[PDB]
Amino acid sequence: FEHATTVPNVPRIPYKALVERAGYAPLNLEITVMSSELIPSTNLEYVTC
Amino acid sequence: FEHATTVPNVPRIPYKALVERAGYAPLNLEITVMSSELIPSTNLEYVTCKYTTVVPSPKVKCCGTLECSSARHADYNCKVFGGVYPENSQMSEAYVEFSADCAADHAQAVKVHTAALKAGLRIVYGNTTSMLDVYVNGVTPGTSKDLKVIAGPISAAYTPFDHKVIIHKGKVYNYDFPEYGAMKPGAFGDIQATSLTSNDLIANTDIRLLKPSAKNVHVPYTQAASGFEMWKNNSGRPLQETAPFGCQIAVNPLRAVDCAYGNIPISLDIPNAAFVRVSDAPLVTALKCEVGECVYSADFGGIATLQYSSDREGQCSVHSHSSTATLQESTVHVLQKGGATIHFSTASPQANFIVSLCGKKTTCNAECKPPADHIVNVPHKNDQEFQAAVSQTSWSWLFALFGGASSLLVIGVMIFACSALLT
Predict the structure, then answer these.
(1) Which CATH number fits domain B284-367: 2.60.40.3080, 2.60.40.350, 2.60.40.10, 2.40.50.320?
(2) Distance from CA of A43 to the nearest CA of B (A)
(3) In chain B, whose CA is at the least distance from the CA of A3?
């Protein structure tokens, strides 16, 4: 079943939601973002001593 | 006792219905239209194949000449070519016949007239579950162990077939074959015979004998191609893949199976032994309808509960009367205080219907929600009704706007009357 929400990007703060299909009881949805590294794209020009 | 309803002609869809009379409970009746083919009346004219042109060894004199007569075969030529192989003579004679094997590969050109209407109905009432079938017309009785059923004729006729038809190995094509005896060469139907083993073959092939001119004996000819082979190149796609109502086609007797079109009126003489009385019928008062989801049009997308207060404990006969919705399972074993559930199945945004729990009526009223699932394997179970597929708030807007467009005209003509009376 397809469902779309918006997590806020603050680590280890849980987000609550309901998913329901018409013909079913609703159910819980706790989504957390527990780590977020972001990696830039790098290259090296020179090396100094 | 006999009762009539109608069932939409969609396969294996049960119909819940009440049949009631005095002194008895309104009793349940479930009628499902099972796998229901239709069979048209056929008559083959001819059977076609490839050909092998029999060209036998020739007849040659040297001093005298020859004169050639007719015989009984297919497309002839016979000819009497003159001074050849140096006043010598020759008799070049050639005909066709069926191929080496037409028990396997042979078409059948068939004309198709009107069609019968067999059915498959499963009928459950009370505790009686019966398997039967009925020729759909208003006269033939459909007889289970004690009952009789007549299925009234269809509201609108239909045929997947056409007037003329070709049966190959297994497939069925709509194509206009030439008539028996009117054969055109290089097209379908060059050889013709009334069975696989009957005589009186019939053939045009544009066979043309030619004058031999060589050192050794040969009989030369030229000929149009096998017009059955120039249909197998260019036959389109059969009726299993182009038919208008999803009907498959089987040919041992050429039947068309599992259509979905129209609706069948139906009538059932209920046997007298299956009539539960109003004493045994658990009468229930204080009916309270509590409507849950009602997400419409799919299969059973509506939940309703009933808070009630009974007289007895036993299996009722639950029913909805308005054709905007039908319920399911049709029997509820009641208790002194119960909350049993139904399954509404409407195809309109207005759950606006009347539940008779054991004949005692009450109303379910709620709005409905469109589903979020575009495409479902399972067919529909209701129809659409104008003055029922328009939502109630839209009725309020239309009525208010029409009243706002009419009442001031009423005020104007009353101003005419008032101005005429006062002066």
Answers:
(1) 2.60.40.350
(2) 49
(3) B372
